[PDB]
PDB file of N, CA, C and O in Angstrom:
ATOM      1  N   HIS A   1     -19.432  11.578 -17.504  1.00 54.46           N
ATOM      2  CA  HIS A   1     -20.395  11.579 -18.792  1.00 54.46           C
ATOM      3  C   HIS A   1     -19.184  11.838 -19.891  1.00 54.46           C
ATOM      4  O   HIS A   1     -18.299  12.583 -19.656  1.00 54.46           O
ATOM      5  N   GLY A   2     -19.579  11.446 -21.092  1.00 52.48           N
ATOM      6  CA  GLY A   2     -18.710  11.826 -22.153  1.00 52.48           C
ATOM      7  C   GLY A   2     -19.091  10.877 -23.403  1.00 52.48           C
ATOM      8  O   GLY A   2     -20.129  10.788 -23.680  1.00 52.48           O
ATOM      9  N   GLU A   3     -18.007  10.287 -23.898  1.00 50.50           N
ATOM     10  CA  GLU A   3     -18.120   9.486 -25.142  1.00 50.50           C
ATOM     11  C   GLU A   3     -16.900   8.491 -25.160  1.00 50.50           C
ATOM     12  O   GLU A   3     -16.049   8.619 -24.118  1.00 50.50           O
ATOM     13  N   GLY A   4     -16.650   7.722 -26.112  1.00 45.96           N
ATOM     14  CA  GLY A   4     -15.548   6.717 -26.007  1.00 45.96           C
ATOM     15  C   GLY A   4     -14.455   7.274 -26.900  1.00 45.96           C
ATOM     16  O   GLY A   4     -13.923   6.686 -27.743  1.00 45.96           O
ATOM     17  N   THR A   5     -13.941   8.425 -26.337  1.00 46.32           N
ATOM     18  CA  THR A   5     -12.689   8.980 -26.876  1.00 46.32           C
ATOM     19  C   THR A   5     -11.396   8.442 -26.498  1.00 46.32           C
ATOM     20  O   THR A   5     -10.643   7.815 -27.189  1.00 46.32           O
ATOM     21  N   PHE A   6     -11.147   8.519 -25.161  1.00 46.43           N
ATOM     22  CA  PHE A   6     -10.069   7.918 -24.534  1.00 46.43           C
ATOM     23  C   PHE A   6     -10.281   6.947 -23.544  1.00 46.43           C
ATOM     24  O   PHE A   6     -10.885   7.155 -22.512  1.00 46.43           O
ATOM     25  N   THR A   7      -9.908   5.735 -23.928  1.00 44.98           N
ATOM     26  CA  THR A   7     -10.250   4.564 -23.001  1.00 44.98           C
ATOM     27  C   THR A   7      -8.853   4.314 -22.144  1.00 44.98           C
ATOM     28  O   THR A   7      -8.999   3.646 -21.187  1.00 44.98           O
ATOM     29  N   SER A   8      -7.727   4.737 -22.696  1.00 45.87           N
ATOM     30  CA  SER A   8      -6.452   4.313 -22.192  1.00 45.87           C
ATOM     31  C   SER A   8      -6.115   4.844 -20.707  1.00 45.87           C
ATOM     32  O   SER A   8      -4.874   4.804 -20.371  1.00 45.87           O
ATOM     33  N   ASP A   9      -7.168   5.442 -20.006  1.00 46.77           N
ATOM     34  CA  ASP A   9      -6.955   5.954 -18.708  1.00 46.77           C
ATOM     35  C   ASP A   9      -6.670   4.700 -17.896  1.00 46.77           C
ATOM     36  O   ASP A   9      -7.471   3.873 -17.748  1.00 46.77           O
ATOM     37  N   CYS A  10      -5.407   4.759 -16.969  1.00 49.51           N
ATOM     38  CA  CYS A  10      -5.182   3.813 -16.207  1.00 49.51           C
ATOM     39  C   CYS A  10      -6.173   3.270 -15.093  1.00 49.51           C
ATOM     40  O   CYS A  10      -6.675   2.431 -14.976  1.00 49.51           O
ATOM     41  N   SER A  11      -6.722   4.517 -14.411  1.00 48.79           N
ATOM     42  CA  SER A  11      -7.773   4.342 -13.405  1.00 48.79           C
ATOM     43  C   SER A  11      -9.109   3.718 -14.189  1.00 48.79           C
ATOM     44  O   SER A  11      -9.839   2.960 -13.509  1.00 48.79           O
ATOM     45  N   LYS A  12      -9.278   4.024 -15.278  1.00 48.27           N
ATOM     46  CA  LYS A  12     -10.471   3.702 -16.029  1.00 48.27           C
ATOM     47  C   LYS A  12     -10.353   2.153 -16.425  1.00 48.27           C
ATOM     48  O   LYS A  12     -11.234   1.424 -16.315  1.00 48.27           O
ATOM     49  N   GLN A  13      -9.158   1.738 -16.739  1.00 47.78           N
ATOM     50  CA  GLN A  13      -8.873   0.353 -17.096  1.00 47.78           C
ATOM     51  C   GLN A  13      -8.921  -0.517 -16.018  1.00 47.78           C
ATOM     52  O   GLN A  13      -9.395  -1.645 -15.863  1.00 47.78           O
ATOM     53  N   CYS A  14      -8.439   0.057 -14.798  1.00 49.49           N
ATOM     54  CA  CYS A  14      -8.648  -0.631 -13.620  1.00 49.49           C
ATOM     55  C   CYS A  14     -10.083  -0.800 -13.059  1.00 49.49           C
ATOM     56  O   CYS A  14     -10.560  -1.731 -12.561  1.00 49.49           O
ATOM     57  N   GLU A  15     -10.950   0.243 -13.436  1.00 49.19           N
ATOM     58  CA  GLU A  15     -12.337   0.283 -13.125  1.00 49.19           C
ATOM     59  C   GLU A  15     -13.120  -0.702 -13.884  1.00 49.19           C
ATOM     60  O   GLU A  15     -14.084  -1.286 -13.448  1.00 49.19           O
ATOM     61  N   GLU A  16     -12.574  -0.988 -15.090  1.00 47.99           N
ATOM     62  CA  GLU A  16     -13.067  -1.915 -15.974  1.00 47.99           C
ATOM     63  C   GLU A  16     -12.675  -3.370 -15.528  1.00 47.99           C
ATOM     64  O   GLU A  16     -13.445  -4.198 -15.718  1.00 47.99           O
ATOM     65  N   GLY A  17     -11.600  -3.399 -14.791  1.00 50.87           N
ATOM     66  CA  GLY A  17     -11.218  -4.526 -14.268  1.00 50.87           C
ATOM     67  C   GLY A  17     -10.262  -5.380 -15.014  1.00 50.87           C
ATOM     68  O   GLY A  17     -10.154  -6.477 -15.013  1.00 50.87           O
ATOM     69  N   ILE A  18      -9.335  -4.615 -15.827  1.00 51.69           N
ATOM     70  CA  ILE A  18      -8.379  -5.185 -16.542  1.00 51.69           C
ATOM     71  C   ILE A  18      -6.820  -4.961 -16.061  1.00 51.69           C
ATOM     72  O   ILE A  18      -6.492  -5.750 -15.273  1.00 51.69           O
ATOM     73  N   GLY A  19      -6.306  -3.789 -16.228  1.00 52.37           N
ATOM     74  CA  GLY A  19      -4.991  -3.575 -15.837  1.00 52.37           C
ATOM     75  C   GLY A  19      -3.945  -4.400 -16.534  1.00 52.37           C
ATOM     76  O   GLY A  19      -2.818  -4.637 -16.039  1.00 52.37           O
ATOM     77  N   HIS A  20      -4.361  -4.997 -17.692  1.00 50.60           N
ATOM     78  CA  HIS A  20      -3.628  -5.891 -18.486  1.00 50.60           C
ATOM     79  C   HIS A  20      -3.169  -5.056 -19.687  1.00 50.60           C
ATOM     80  O   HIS A  20      -3.953  -4.600 -20.272  1.00 50.60           O
ATOM     81  N   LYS A  21      -1.901  -5.383 -19.907  1.00 52.80           N
ATOM     82  CA  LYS A  21      -1.278  -4.654 -21.263  1.00 52.80           C
ATOM     83  C   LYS A  21      -0.979  -3.265 -20.655  1.00 52.80           C
ATOM     84  O   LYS A  21      -0.488  -2.272 -21.507  1.00 52.80           O
ATOM     85  N   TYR A  22      -1.208  -2.876 -19.461  1.00 53.40           N
ATOM     86  CA  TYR A  22      -0.946  -1.591 -18.955  1.00 53.40           C
ATOM     87  C   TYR A  22       0.033  -1.625 -17.835  1.00 53.40           C
ATOM     88  O   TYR A  22      -0.343  -2.037 -16.699  1.00 53.40           O
ATOM     89  N   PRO A  23       1.310  -1.409 -18.089  1.00 50.88           N
ATOM     90  CA  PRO A  23       2.558  -1.631 -17.195  1.00 50.88           C
ATOM     91  C   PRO A  23       2.393  -0.583 -15.955  1.00 50.88           C
ATOM     92  O   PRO A  23       3.225  -0.677 -15.021  1.00 50.88           O
ATOM     93  N   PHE A  24       1.680   0.445 -16.025  1.00 53.37           N
ATOM     94  CA  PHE A  24       1.472   1.495 -15.163  1.00 53.37           C
ATOM     95  C   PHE A  24       0.268   1.289 -14.351  1.00 53.37           C
ATOM     96  O   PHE A  24      -0.122   2.039 -13.410  1.00 53.37           O
ATOM     97  N   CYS A  25      -0.470   0.014 -14.496  1.00 56.83           N
ATOM     98  CA  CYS A  25      -1.779  -0.315 -13.830  1.00 56.83           C
ATOM     99  C   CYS A  25      -1.627  -1.480 -12.926  1.00 56.83           C
ATOM    100  O   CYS A  25      -1.657  -2.641 -13.415  1.00 56.83           O
ATOM    101  N   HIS A  26      -1.410  -1.211 -11.819  1.00 55.78           N
ATOM    102  CA  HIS A  26      -1.401  -2.336 -10.701  1.00 55.78           C
ATOM    103  C   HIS A  26      -2.538  -2.123  -9.832  1.00 55.78           C
ATOM    104  O   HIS A  26      -2.402  -1.140  -8.933  1.00 55.78           O
ATOM    105  N   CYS A  27      -3.674  -2.753 -10.140  1.00 54.87           N
ATOM    106  CA  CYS A  27      -4.822  -2.531  -9.329  1.00 54.87           C
ATOM    107  C   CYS A  27      -5.472  -3.622  -8.692  1.00 54.87           C
ATOM    108  O   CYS A  27      -4.802  -4.825  -8.646  1.00 54.87           O
ATOM    109  N   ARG A  28      -6.595  -3.619  -8.193  1.00 56.77           N
ATOM    110  CA  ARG A  28      -7.247  -4.830  -7.437  1.00 56.77           C
ATOM    111  C   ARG A  28      -8.247  -5.546  -8.476  1.00 56.77           C
ATOM    112  O   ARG A  28      -9.548  -5.212  -8.484  1.00 56.77           O
TER     113      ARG A  28
END
């Protein structure tokens, strides 16, 4: 729970299914 403060979380970007523009995010 929370709000849209910080979206730049690597794990979060991977859970969104991107990992794009994120050099530290190699995900599935």
